[PDB]
Scaffold this active site. Structure first.
Site, PDB file in Angstrom:
ATOM      1  N   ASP A  97      -0.779  -0.395  -5.144  1.00 29.61           N
ATOM      2  CA  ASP A  97      -1.990   0.158  -5.405  1.00 29.61           C
ATOM      3  C   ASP A  97      -1.810   1.503  -5.846  1.00 29.61           C
ATOM      4  OD1 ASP A  97      -1.239   1.010  -2.916  1.00 29.61           O
ATOM      5  OD2 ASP A  97      -3.042   0.332  -1.743  1.00 29.61           O
ATOM      6  N   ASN A 120     -25.025   8.077 -22.524  1.00 28.30           N
ATOM      7  CA  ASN A 120     -25.361   7.550 -21.308  1.00 28.30           C
ATOM      8  C   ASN A 120     -23.914   7.233 -20.611  1.00 28.30           C
ATOM      9  OD1 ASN A 120     -24.219   5.478 -22.969  1.00 28.30           O
ATOM     10  ND2 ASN A 120     -25.785   4.161 -22.446  1.00 28.30           N
ATOM     11  N   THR A 136      -7.308   3.104  -2.135  1.00 29.31           N
ATOM     12  CA  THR A 136      -6.879   1.776  -1.738  1.00 29.31           C
ATOM     13  C   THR A 136      -7.809   0.718  -2.262  1.00 29.31           C
ATOM     14  OG1 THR A 136      -5.405   2.450   0.113  1.00 29.31           O
ATOM     15  CG2 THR A 136      -6.079   0.154   0.093  1.00 29.31           C
ATOM     16  N   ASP A 182       0.837  -1.212   0.060  1.00 31.00           N
ATOM     17  CA  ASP A 182       0.168   0.130   0.053  1.00 31.00           C
ATOM     18  C   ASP A 182       0.767   1.357   0.046  1.00 31.00           C
ATOM     19  OD1 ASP A 182      -2.213   1.447   0.131  1.00 31.00           O
ATOM     20  OD2 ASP A 182      -2.362   1.512   2.210  1.00 31.00           O
ATOM     21  N   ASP A 193     -21.395   5.595 -20.462  1.00 28.75           N
ATOM     22  CA  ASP A 193     -20.850   4.278 -20.219  1.00 28.75           C
ATOM     23  C   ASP A 193     -19.472   3.840 -21.096  1.00 28.75           C
ATOM     24  OD1 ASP A 193     -21.689   3.733 -22.843  1.00 28.75           O
ATOM     25  OD2 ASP A 193     -22.969   2.029 -22.174  1.00 28.75           O
TER      26      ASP A 193
HETATM   27  C1  LIG Z   1     -15.222  -2.605 -18.831  1.00 27.85           C
HETATM   28  O1  LIG Z   1     -15.538  -4.264 -18.765  1.00 27.85           O
HETATM   29  C2  LIG Z   1     -16.650  -4.706 -18.438  1.00 27.85           C
HETATM   30  C3  LIG Z   1     -16.975  -6.090 -18.247  1.00 27.85           C
HETATM   31  O2  LIG Z   1     -16.921  -6.787 -19.220  1.00 27.85           O
HETATM   32  C4  LIG Z   1     -18.027  -4.026 -19.135  1.00 27.85           C
HETATM   33  O3  LIG Z   1     -19.160  -4.077 -18.443  1.00 27.85           O
HETATM   34  C5  LIG Z   1     -19.942  -5.025 -18.957  1.00 27.85           C
HETATM   35  O4  LIG Z   1     -20.985  -4.387 -20.059  1.00 27.85           O
HETATM   36  C6  LIG Z   1     -21.977  -4.815 -20.614  1.00 27.85           C
HETATM   37  C7  LIG Z   1     -22.824  -3.586 -21.309  1.00 27.85           C
HETATM   38  O5  LIG Z   1     -22.942  -2.416 -20.543  1.00 27.85           O
HETATM   39  C8  LIG Z   1     -22.791  -5.436 -19.586  1.00 27.85           C
HETATM   40  O6  LIG Z   1     -23.899  -6.287 -19.901  1.00 27.85           O
HETATM   41  C9  LIG Z   1     -25.314  -6.009 -19.588  1.00 27.85           C
HETATM   42  O7  LIG Z   1     -25.463  -7.057 -18.346  1.00 27.85           O
HETATM   43  C10 LIG Z   1     -26.919  -7.023 -17.924  1.00 27.85           C
HETATM   44  C11 LIG Z   1     -26.835  -8.369 -16.779  1.00 27.85           C
HETATM   45  O8  LIG Z   1     -25.714  -8.012 -15.679  1.00 27.85           O
HETATM   46  C12 LIG Z   1     -25.753  -8.669 -14.581  1.00 27.85           C
HETATM   47  O9  LIG Z   1     -24.949  -9.768 -15.010  1.00 27.85           O
HETATM   48  C13 LIG Z   1     -23.316  -9.569 -15.020  1.00 27.85           C
HETATM   49  C14 LIG Z   1     -22.887 -11.148 -15.386  1.00 27.85           C
HETATM   50  O10 LIG Z   1     -22.670 -11.882 -14.124  1.00 27.85           O
HETATM   51  C15 LIG Z   1     -22.832  -9.010 -13.937  1.00 27.85           C
HETATM   52  O11 LIG Z   1     -21.494  -8.791 -14.001  1.00 27.85           O
HETATM   53  C16 LIG Z   1     -23.385  -7.750 -13.829  1.00 27.85           C
HETATM   54  O12 LIG Z   1     -22.666  -6.957 -12.649  1.00 27.85           O
HETATM   55  C17 LIG Z   1     -23.245  -5.419 -12.631  1.00 27.85           C
HETATM   56  O13 LIG Z   1     -24.431  -5.099 -11.831  1.00 27.85           O
HETATM   57  C18 LIG Z   1     -24.007  -5.278 -10.474  1.00 27.85           C
HETATM   58  C19 LIG Z   1     -25.312  -4.933  -9.670  1.00 27.85           C
HETATM   59  O14 LIG Z   1     -26.426  -5.608 -10.341  1.00 27.85           O
HETATM   60  C20 LIG Z   1     -22.709  -4.892  -9.898  1.00 27.85           C
HETATM   61  O15 LIG Z   1     -22.505  -5.487  -8.604  1.00 27.85           O
HETATM   62  C21 LIG Z   1     -21.631  -4.983 -10.799  1.00 27.85           C
HETATM   63  O16 LIG Z   1     -20.552  -4.199 -10.227  1.00 27.85           O
HETATM   64  C22 LIG Z   1     -21.933  -4.457 -12.271  1.00 27.85           C
HETATM   65  O17 LIG Z   1     -22.254  -3.123 -12.265  1.00 27.85           O
HETATM   66  C23 LIG Z   1     -21.963  -2.469 -13.296  1.00 27.85           C
HETATM   67  O18 LIG Z   1     -22.348  -2.801 -14.586  1.00 27.85           O
HETATM   68  C24 LIG Z   1     -23.819  -2.376 -14.619  1.00 27.85           C
HETATM   69  C25 LIG Z   1     -24.664  -3.050 -15.858  1.00 27.85           C
HETATM   70  O19 LIG Z   1     -24.911  -4.489 -15.884  1.00 27.85           O
HETATM   71  C26 LIG Z   1     -24.150  -0.937 -14.473  1.00 27.85           C
HETATM   72  O20 LIG Z   1     -25.387  -0.729 -14.454  1.00 27.85           O
HETATM   73  C27 LIG Z   1     -23.297  -0.431 -13.199  1.00 27.85           C
HETATM   74  O21 LIG Z   1     -23.420   0.954 -12.894  1.00 27.85           O
HETATM   75  C28 LIG Z   1     -21.861  -1.047 -13.044  1.00 27.85           C
HETATM   76  O22 LIG Z   1     -21.196  -0.086 -14.117  1.00 27.85           O
HETATM   77  C29 LIG Z   1     -24.967  -7.879 -13.557  1.00 27.85           C
HETATM   78  O23 LIG Z   1     -24.987  -8.481 -12.314  1.00 27.85           O
HETATM   79  C30 LIG Z   1     -27.767  -7.474 -19.046  1.00 27.85           C
HETATM   80  O24 LIG Z   1     -29.052  -7.920 -18.383  1.00 27.85           O
HETATM   81  C31 LIG Z   1     -27.859  -6.395 -20.132  1.00 27.85           C
HETATM   82  O25 LIG Z   1     -28.854  -6.687 -21.125  1.00 27.85           O
HETATM   83  C32 LIG Z   1     -29.444  -5.509 -21.790  1.00 27.85           C
HETATM   84  O26 LIG Z   1     -29.173  -4.815 -22.832  1.00 27.85           O
HETATM   85  C33 LIG Z   1     -29.291  -5.853 -24.051  1.00 27.85           C
HETATM   86  C34 LIG Z   1     -28.288  -5.440 -25.176  1.00 27.85           C
HETATM   87  O27 LIG Z   1     -27.328  -6.298 -25.572  1.00 27.85           O
HETATM   88  C35 LIG Z   1     -30.539  -6.055 -24.305  1.00 27.85           C
HETATM   89  O28 LIG Z   1     -30.455  -7.128 -25.322  1.00 27.85           O
HETATM   90  C36 LIG Z   1     -31.582  -6.476 -23.381  1.00 27.85           C
HETATM   91  O29 LIG Z   1     -32.706  -6.063 -23.714  1.00 27.85           O
HETATM   92  C37 LIG Z   1     -31.081  -5.534 -21.843  1.00 27.85           C
HETATM   93  O30 LIG Z   1     -31.958  -4.581 -21.527  1.00 27.85           O
HETATM   94  C38 LIG Z   1     -32.931  -4.710 -20.604  1.00 27.85           C
HETATM   95  O31 LIG Z   1     -32.525  -4.075 -19.519  1.00 27.85           O
HETATM   96  C39 LIG Z   1     -32.457  -2.723 -19.642  1.00 27.85           C
HETATM   97  C40 LIG Z   1     -31.924  -2.141 -18.121  1.00 27.85           C
HETATM   98  O32 LIG Z   1     -32.641  -2.515 -16.994  1.00 27.85           O
HETATM   99  C41 LIG Z   1     -33.686  -2.145 -19.880  1.00 27.85           C
HETATM  100  O33 LIG Z   1     -33.689  -0.541 -19.930  1.00 27.85           O
HETATM  101  C42 LIG Z   1     -34.364  -2.549 -21.174  1.00 27.85           C
HETATM  102  O34 LIG Z   1     -35.473  -2.106 -21.604  1.00 27.85           O
HETATM  103  C43 LIG Z   1     -34.394  -4.138 -21.067  1.00 27.85           C
HETATM  104  O35 LIG Z   1     -35.448  -4.601 -20.261  1.00 27.85           O
HETATM  105  C44 LIG Z   1     -26.304  -6.053 -20.443  1.00 27.85           C
HETATM  106  O36 LIG Z   1     -26.037  -7.405 -21.401  1.00 27.85           O
HETATM  107  C45 LIG Z   1     -22.334  -6.096 -18.315  1.00 27.85           C
HETATM  108  O37 LIG Z   1     -22.962  -6.603 -17.165  1.00 27.85           O
HETATM  109  C46 LIG Z   1     -21.001  -5.251 -17.927  1.00 27.85           C
HETATM  110  N1  LIG Z   1     -20.337  -5.911 -16.744  1.00 27.85           N
HETATM  111  C47 LIG Z   1     -19.833  -5.420 -15.659  1.00 27.85           C
HETATM  112  C48 LIG Z   1     -19.065  -6.335 -14.782  1.00 27.85           C
HETATM  113  O38 LIG Z   1     -19.770  -4.362 -15.395  1.00 27.85           O
HETATM  114  C49 LIG Z   1     -17.859  -2.467 -19.393  1.00 27.85           C
HETATM  115  O39 LIG Z   1     -18.525  -2.056 -20.438  1.00 27.85           O
HETATM  116  C50 LIG Z   1     -16.253  -2.415 -19.720  1.00 27.85           C
HETATM  117  N2  LIG Z   1     -15.844  -0.858 -19.785  1.00 27.85           N
HETATM  118  C51 LIG Z   1     -15.445  -0.237 -21.121  1.00 27.85           C
HETATM  119  C52 LIG Z   1     -15.541   1.170 -20.957  1.00 27.85           C
HETATM  120  O40 LIG Z   1     -15.159  -0.814 -21.968  1.00 27.85           O
HETATM  121 CA    CA Z   2     -22.809   4.982 -24.615  1.00 27.96          CA
HETATM  122 ZN    ZN Z   3      -3.529   5.697   2.365  1.00 27.26          ZN
END
Ligand SMILES: *[C@@H]1O[C@H](CO)[C@@H](O[C@@H]2O[C@H](CO)[C@@H](O[C@@H]3O[C@H](CO[C@H]4O[C@H](CO)[C@@H](O)[C@H](O[C@H]5O[C@H](CO)[C@@H](O)[C@H](O)[C@@H]5O[C@H]5O[C@H](CO)[C@@H](O)[C@H](O)[C@@H]5O)[C@@H]4O)[C@@H](O)[C@H](O[C@H]4O[C@H](CO)[C@@H](O)[C@H](O)[C@@H]4O[C@H]4O[C@H](CO)[C@@H](O)[C@H](O)[C@@H]4O)[C@@H]3O)[C@H](O)[C@H]2NC(C)=O)[C@H](O)[C@H]1NC(C)=O
Ligand code: CA
Ligand code: ZN
Ligand code: XSU
Ligand code: CL
Ligand code: K
Ligand code: NA
Length: 805
Positions: free
Chosen positions: A308, A685, A159, A121, A687
């Site tokens: 870190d 959005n 951290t 750290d 993202d």
């Molecule tokens: C960096 O790398 C990461 C990892 O690869 C990239 O993040 C991924 O990007 C994807 C697109 O944004 C995303 O895919 C979505 O996943 C949805 C299901 O997600 C759950 O399951 C996974 C798998 O185990 C899990 O990891 C997720 O974890 C997130 O959420 C929990 C809390 O619930 C947190 O603890 C965790 O930290 C993480 O949060 C982060 O990501 C979420 C988004 O998932 C953000 O909201 C948070 O702020 C935070 O950043 C989940 O537990 C899946 O359901 C999605 O599908 C929708 O879209 C598709 C399009 O293909 C569509 O077909 C569907 O219709 C569906 O839409 C429906 O739901 C909508 C929302 O309610 C609604 O509006 C519509 O009308 C529909 O009903 C989608 O596939 C993936 O989850 C994340 N993964 C992670 C780990 O973050 C990231 O993009 C990279 N960054 C860069 C800059 O490159």
């Molecule tokens: Ca975007």
């Molecule tokens: Zn410190």
């Protein structure tokens, strides 16, 4: 409730955590107030300390001792780490010559080289040089293994966000640990350093390495250590685990040190009190390496030494107070210190307005030591917006400063002289990476890289398939002797159309005019050739970018530039051009100031129109290929094509025009030519990913012309600047930016001055990796070079940081 009446007998530092109300004996039981009654007596023995002495050698085993010097200790796996040195005439590992580890040299029964991750750290990158005299073990790992001059942490440089990024390969916005303190409005719950809420699994997203391992049948040591377990005991526990039978023995282990961060907060990063903590960490590394050598594992295990974040000089007097800016200071909640995050104190207060808070914090005092942002306007390189735990209002604090709500917060809480948390490009926040072992390279220096990349490498070292993450898998192949990951380029999804002349001028009713009605067989075939791509090799140096999503687009050739023109967004996705060292800059002639020309290759229905811009009183337009850099008066007319126009706020055109008229030529002069790829980005959005059409929140008034949230440029040249950009035989050099497309220049406090005093400073703040632009655009660049794909992946992760040495 815990039934603390059970016993740790034969269970000390057990790997499987037992569930309440049963009493625990694992390395975190202290942190949960859950250890069995006899855990200290049995599991935290201290008698006779940590080192064998001459007189203990061959002793009769006394099980009360912290460690052993008896003849049976190697077979029991519990010798003091110096046993073989003291009692058997061996050398300390640090005293042995460096010898290349070409293959793993492992005991029978080892299926793979174990991985040990030693994390420190607050270990600032410059400690490797500045503390080198007092860290001989760490210096040997560094010089004998693979090292970077520094490793870039994630923002905020705190951290828990960085440790969990190390664990997951994810940005904080994705893994969920967005600070050391957080409020989650969905949960209605707060995460804090002190207390129990931070142990709830709902905070922790993604998939950390210990879970990845376990899911794929690789056993993991417990990565976490309660603060009161002394370091010597942590090392001894690791070494004991490494003597477990094959079917019970983990393959991956972690050690975490609270130092040098603990002392650095008290004394500053280079306080004279810092020498001792660095010595003590080095001694701990020596214990581990000696211990591995006793177990004949020193040429078997891969060791990562990693930090870190760094540490900066920060004192209580360098604090800015929001009470000196805001009238309403009791209506906000501030997360304070080396970053600020602001939200309403009450969700029932309808008089809360972020707009007035931002305005009251913008450029109010001449030397102001923080800058406010709505989170979507933060530099995209921070990747710090897409999470409900990140407050809309953010303050980027200058290095060496803090921000606080009111003065009473600083003295009813000077003590500290060091802190961290600042912008992850700041030199003081940079940290360390060393890899040593059979799988790492021998005596090898690698360029600085980002900590988000390490999870993939840790997976590669263990034979694991990484969970989806933000690293670019393959970009760190050059660190490794073996176990490299050999990705294929992604497949192009949409093929372009190559339109010829298909429309007459009078088919267009765009409301555009140009003074271009001015009339030769010699030069008539030559312009035909340019429109069919005869100069394309000059302007498109690395192949056309591949479009990785389904869309309709056209390739358009011109004498001076090539573009991929989206029929859906009505503008180029990318525009590619080369500017030699010898290129000349020219004016936009007076007669062409408002010239816009229909493109007879593209239908009226898929073109922008000038009338929309006339009627939209807020929006103007610019051009992607700059008319200032035209190769000739005749070629200049191409630059005024409607197909090269993009929507620009007047305030942004000041930035853009300075970049195009002044800076491109400057870079070509300095770099011996440059190739530029510019284009729009749509990320409404926030993202970090390309928007679909249905996500666009703003259009040029009355039209279907979408407004970009940002504009990018990728500026490539030859790493060997004795060769011109367009005849480069070897590695490339790149710098890129993602500029926010804003209707004001409120970010730049000096924007009332000439562009020469503020524009380049703005662009430096918004420096970017090519990979960042890839995510934001669905494009894949550098598809046709002479270079290996892994080298190209490394190039795409490069960030030009603009810090001194
Ligand atoms: C960096 O790398 C990461 C990892 O690869 C990239 O993040 C991924 O990007 C994807 C697109 O944004 C995303 O895919 C979505 O996943 C949805 C299901 O997600 C759950 O399951 C996974 C798998 O185990 C899990 O990891 C997720 O974890 C997130 O959420 C929990 C809390 O619930 C947190 O603890 C965790 O930290 C993480 O949060 C982060 O990501 C979420 C988004 O998932 C953000 O909201 C948070 O702020 C935070 O950043 C989940 O537990 C899946 O359901 C999605 O599908 C929708 O879209 C598709 C399009 O293909 C569509 O077909 C569907 O219709 C569906 O839409 C429906 O739901 C909508 C929302 O309610 C609604 O509006 C519509 O009308 C529909 O009903 C989608 O596939 C993936 O989850 C994340 N993964 C992670 C780990 O973050 C990231 O993009 C990279 N960054 C860069 C800059 O490159
Ligand atoms: Ca975007
Ligand atoms: Zn410190
Ligand atoms: O054991 C761990 C640990 C160790 C850990 O390794 C992950 C490894 C993954 C692979 O790559 C190497 C790292 N991952 C976690 C969490 C992320 C899952 C935890 N702890 C951390 C801290 C402990 C103990 C006490 N502490 C503290 O009170 N301060 C909180 C306040 N703070 C501090 N320093 N400065 C400051 O402001 C630290 C921070
Ligand atoms: Cl925080
Ligand atoms: K206008
Ligand atoms: Na300004």
């Amino acid at each position: 409730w815990t039934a603390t009446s059970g016993s740790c007998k034969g269970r000390c530092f057990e790997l499987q955590e037992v569930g309440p109300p049963d009493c625990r004996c694992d390395n975190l039981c202290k942190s949960y107030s859950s250890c069995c009654h006899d855990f200290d007596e049995l599991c935290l023995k201290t008698a006779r300390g940590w080192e064998c002495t001459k007189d203990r050698c061959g002793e009769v085993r006394n099980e009360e001792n912290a460690c052993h010097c008896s003849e049976d200790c190697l077979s029991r796996g519990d010798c003091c780490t110096n046993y073989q040195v003291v009692c058997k005439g061996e050398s300390h590992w640090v005293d042995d010559d460096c010898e290349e580890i070409k293959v793993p040299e492992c005991p029978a029964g080892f299926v793979r080289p174990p991985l040990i991750i030693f994390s420190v750290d607050g270990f600032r990158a410059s400690y490797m040089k500045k503390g080198s005299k007092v860290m001989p073990n760490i210096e040997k790992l560094r010089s004998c293994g693979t090292h970077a001059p520094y490793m870039r942490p994630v923002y905020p440089t705190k951290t828990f966000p960085n440790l969990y990024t190390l664990a997951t390969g994810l940005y904080p916005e994705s893994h969920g640990i967005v600070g050391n303190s957080m409020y989650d409005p969905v949960f209605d719950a707060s995460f804090h350093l002190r207390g129990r809420e931070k142990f709830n699994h709902r905070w922790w997203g993604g998939q950390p390495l210990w879970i990845t391992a376990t899911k794929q049948g690789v056993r993991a040591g417990t990565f976490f250590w309660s603060v009161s377990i002394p370091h010597e005991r942590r090392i001894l526990t690791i070494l004991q685990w490494l003597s477990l039978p094959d079917n019970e023995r983990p393959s991956v282990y972690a050690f975490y040190s609270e130092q040098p961060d603990f002392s650095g907060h008290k004394y500053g990063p280079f306080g004279p009190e810092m020498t001792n903590p660095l010595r003590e960490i080095d001694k701990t590394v020596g214990q581990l390496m000696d211990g591995l050598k006793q177990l004949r594992l020193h040429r078997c295990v891969n060791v990562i030494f990693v930090g870190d974040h760094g540490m900066e000089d920060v004192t209580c007097d360098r604090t800015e107070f929001l009470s000196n800016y805001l009238t309403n200071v009791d209506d906000i909640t501030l997360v304070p210190g080396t970053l600020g995050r602001i939200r309403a104190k009450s969700i029932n207060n309808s008089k809360y307005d972020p707009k007035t808070i931002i305005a009251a914090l913008t450029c109010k005092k001449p030397d102001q030591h923080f800058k406010p942002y709505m989170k979507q306007h933060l530099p995209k390189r921070l990747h710090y917006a897409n999470n409900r735990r990140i407050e809309d209002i953010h303050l980027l604090v200058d290095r060496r400063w803090h921000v606080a709500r009111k003065p009473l917060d600083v003295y009813k809480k000077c003590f500290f002289q060091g802190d961290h948390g600042f912008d992850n490009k700041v030199n003081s926040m940079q940290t360390v990476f060393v890899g040593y072992g059979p799988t790492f390279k021998y005596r090898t220096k690698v360029p600085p890289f980002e900590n988000i990349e390490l999870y993939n490498v840790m997976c590669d070292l263990l034979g694991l398939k990484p969970a989806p993450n933000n690293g670019t898998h393959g970009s760190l192949n050059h660190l490794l002797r073996t176990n490299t990951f050999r990705p294929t380029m992604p497949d192009e999804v949409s093929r372009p159309n190559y339109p010829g002349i298909m429309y007459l001028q009078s088919e267009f009713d765009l409301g555009c005019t140009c003074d271009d009605k001015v009339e030769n067989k010699l030069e008539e075939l030559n312009k035909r050739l340019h429109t069919k791509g005869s100069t394309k090799e000059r302007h498109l140096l690395y192949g056309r970018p591949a479009v990785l999503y389904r869309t309709s687009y056209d390739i358009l050739y011109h004498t001076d530039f090539e573009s991929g023109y989206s029929e859906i967004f009505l503008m180029p996705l990318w525009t590619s051009y080369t500017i030699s060292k010898q290129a000349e800059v020219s004016s936009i002639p007076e007669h062409l100031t408002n010239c816009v020309r229909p493109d007879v290759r593209v239908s009226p229905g898929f073109s922008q129109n000038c009338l929309a811009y006339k009627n939209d009183k807020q929006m103007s337009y610019g051009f992607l290929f700059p008319p200032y850099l035209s190769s000739s008066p005749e070629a200049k007319y191409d630059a005024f094509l409607v197909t090269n126009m993009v929507p620009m706020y007047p305030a942004f055109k000041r930035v853009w025009a300075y970049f195009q008229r002044v800076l491109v030529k400057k870079y070509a002069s300095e770099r011996n030519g440059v190739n530029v790829i510019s284009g729009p980005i749509f990320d409404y959005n926030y993202d970090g990913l390309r928007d679909t059409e249905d996500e666009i929140k703003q259009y040029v008034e009355g039209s279907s012309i979408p407004v970009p949230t940002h504009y990018y440029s990728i500026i490539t040249s030859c790493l060997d600047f004795t060769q011109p950009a367009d005849k480069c035989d070897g590695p490339l050099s790149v710098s890129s930016f993602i500029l926010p497309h804003r209707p004001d220049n409120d970010e730049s406090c000096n924007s009332s001055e000439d562009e020469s005093k503020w524009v380049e400073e703005l662009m430096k703040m918004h420096t970017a990796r090519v990979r960042d632009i890839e995510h934001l655009t669905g494009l894949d660049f550098y598809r046709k070079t002479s270079r290996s794909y892994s080298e190209i992946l490394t190039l795409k992760t490069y960030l030009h940081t603009y810090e001194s040495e």
